[PDB]
Ligand binder design. Sequence first.
Ligand code: 412
Length: 237
Amino acid sequence: IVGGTASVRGEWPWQVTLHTTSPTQRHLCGGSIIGNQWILTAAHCFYGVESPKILRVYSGILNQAEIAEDTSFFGVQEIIIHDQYKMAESGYDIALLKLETTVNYADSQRPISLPSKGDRNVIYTDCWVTGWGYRKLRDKIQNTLQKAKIPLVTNEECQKRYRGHKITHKMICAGYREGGKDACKGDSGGPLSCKHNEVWHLVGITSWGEGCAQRERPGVYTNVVEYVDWILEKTQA
Ligand SMILES: *[B@@]1(C2=[C][C]=C([C][C][N]C([N])=[N])[C]=[C]2)O[C][C]([C][O])O1
């Protein structure tokens, strides 16, 4: 996260840090708890990943330092990538991780509600982007979970900032005309939490953009509301 600050412990209980153990353990992506055994994250976060076996999901984490060889984690039983996904920039950048065990909810780890199809004409206030991602073009995973308040931008406005791309209605962007605050490498899969009437909603999933926090270059996120049917279909046994 660029231009953000340290989050308070338990302030984003749905945020998880997804690690890979190969070659050696490290943070790979962010993700969101949406069900007792479900993590919603980004599809392009599994590039080169041929097995769920090297994955480890950690919940209720604030500082990466809390994670050691003796720290408990959730194994991943299955990785579900949208069958239409090809690459972040083309859309459908969404994936579901079915955990091997159930998450016992608590103040430190609980699910975030998905937006409703009726929440489309709703103006989201208090939108934040979080993660342990880079702080700059060429930085490194951050120890403390970072947070940054970032306003949503209309698709038409976003499209103007990405003439070479096609910003579809299945995407949603957020950023400042002058940049300064934005997601960066490592925040992918991270949730775009947004407040709607006192209730936190998972509006988007950190997907892509050009550089980090650059002027006139809004972050691009998967428009979650457009996938509620897909999520239901894939999570219902
Ligand atoms: B993501 C990731 C990669 C690159 C960026 C920078 C462009 N996006 C912006 N500025 N919003 C953000 C996030 O983090 C983990 C990796 C996994 O492949 O991708």
